[PDB]
Amino acid sequence: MGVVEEAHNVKVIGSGEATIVLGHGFGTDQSVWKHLVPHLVDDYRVVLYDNMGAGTTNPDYFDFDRYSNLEGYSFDLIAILEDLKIESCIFVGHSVSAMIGVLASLNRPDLFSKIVMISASPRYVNDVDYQGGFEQEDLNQLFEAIRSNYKAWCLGFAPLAVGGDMDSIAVQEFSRTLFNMRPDIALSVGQTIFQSDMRQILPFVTVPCHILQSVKDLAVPVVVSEYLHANLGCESVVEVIPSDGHLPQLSSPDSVIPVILRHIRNDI
Ligand SMILES: O=C1C=C[C@H](Cc2ccc(-c3ccccc3)cc2[N+](=O)[O-])O1
C-alpha cells in the first residue's frame, strides 16, 4: 500500500462493497478489535487502522501541530478512505475515534452510512450544566502524573480504564500498548483529547449514530450517552451495556460483542 496506509498499519480483510471501518481509542491500537472482527469478515470488507501516535506507529510521523486538535485525525481517516477507494462505510469508533468519525462525517457525510460509537464522549470536563466525568483539577493531576513518571502512570491507569478484574488479560494488554507510546506523544494526545469540545457541532451531524457504552466506565458517565442522544442532529439510538470498562469489546466480549453486532447489522 501507499505511505499513508503503511504509516497507519492499514489492514483490509475481504472484498465487496459492504465495508466496515474500525477506529480505536487512546492507548490501544487496532488489536482492540480482535474479538469483534471474526464476526464481521464473512459479511463485510473489514478495514483496520491505527491512529498516528499509537505505540505501533512511527514516532517520526507524529506531527505535533497536525494532531493539536481532533481534525488532524479526521483528515487522516478521510485520506485512508479515499486511498482505499471506499465510497461508503459503516464506521465503528471507539472512544476518541467516535468523535474523529463524527468530525470526518461533517466534512464528508457521503462517506458514512452510519456511525457506531463505543465509549464515546464529546466533552470530559464538567461545567455547571454538564457532567463529563472530570473536574479540571482531575486532569491536572493526570498530566502531572504522566509527566512525572509515565511508566508508573501506565501501570496504575490500565486496570482502572479496563475495569473488571485487575489480573485480567485485557489489563495486561492495555498497560503494554499504553506503555509502548512515546511519553511526550502520550502527553500531547492526552491534552488534545481532554481539552476537546465536540458538544457544539453535534447538531450538525447528518449520519445516524448508535451510542454504546459500558454502564460502568471511568471516563464516560451514563448521562454523556443521553447528552449525545439528545443533541446529535440525525437519528440516534442509545444502548447502555451491562459491562464494566472503557474497552469492553476487548475485556468483556461475551456480553459486549453481541450488542455491537446488533447495532452494526441493523438500522434504526
Ligand atoms: O481519550 C480518552 C479520554 C478519556 C478516555 C479514557 C482515557 C483514555 C486515555 C487516557 C490517556 C492515555 C495516555 C496518556 C494520557 C491519557 C486517559 C483517559 N482517562 O483519563 O480517562 O478516553
Side-chain angles (χ1 to χ4, degrees), residues 141-154:
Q141 264 162 83
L142 214 69
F143 315 117
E144 218 213 328
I146 281 139
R147 181 83 202 261
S148 151
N149 175 1
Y150 187 57
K151 153 154 213 84
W153 182 75
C154 292

Side-chain angles (χ1 to χ4, degrees), residues 137-209:
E137 262 281 313
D138 286 269
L139 306 180
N140 308 124
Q141 264 162 83
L142 214 69
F143 315 117
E144 218 213 328
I146 281 139
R147 181 83 202 261
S148 151
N149 175 1
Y150 187 57
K151 153 154 213 84
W153 182 75
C154 292
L155 257 45
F157 180 64
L160 281 171
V162 170
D165 40 313
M166 317 78 169
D167 58 316
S168 62
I169 284 131
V171 172
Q172 195 78 340
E173 286 187 40
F174 187 60
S175 103
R176 190 199 47 226
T177 56
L178 248 179
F179 194 46
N180 286 141
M181 272 197 290
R182 193 162 100 201
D184 65 330
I185 295 176
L187 195 54
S188 212
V189 184
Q191 150 171 129
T192 298
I193 294 176
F194 262 104
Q195 256 62 231
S196 73
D197 201 347
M198 289 301 291
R199 298 174 294 181
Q200 298 86 12
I201 45 77
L202 306 175
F204 291 89
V205 168
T206 59
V207 179
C209 291

Side-chain angles (χ1 to χ4, degrees), residues 92-145:
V92 184
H94 170 236
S95 198
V96 67
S97 265
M99 300 289 105
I100 294 160
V102 165
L103 254 204
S105 79
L106 295 175
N107 294 149
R108 302 281 319 265
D110 60 303
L111 288 190
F112 304 91
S113 59
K114 100 164 90 182
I115 294 167
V116 177
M117 329 180 159
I118 300 150
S119 321
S121 168
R123 174 72 159 171
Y124 304 96
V125 191
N126 302 330
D127 69 50
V128 86
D129 194 33
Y130 172 93
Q131 176 74 29
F134 309 74
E135 300 289 331
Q136 188 87 63
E137 262 281 313
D138 286 269
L139 306 180
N140 308 124
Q141 264 162 83
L142 214 69
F143 315 117
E144 218 213 328

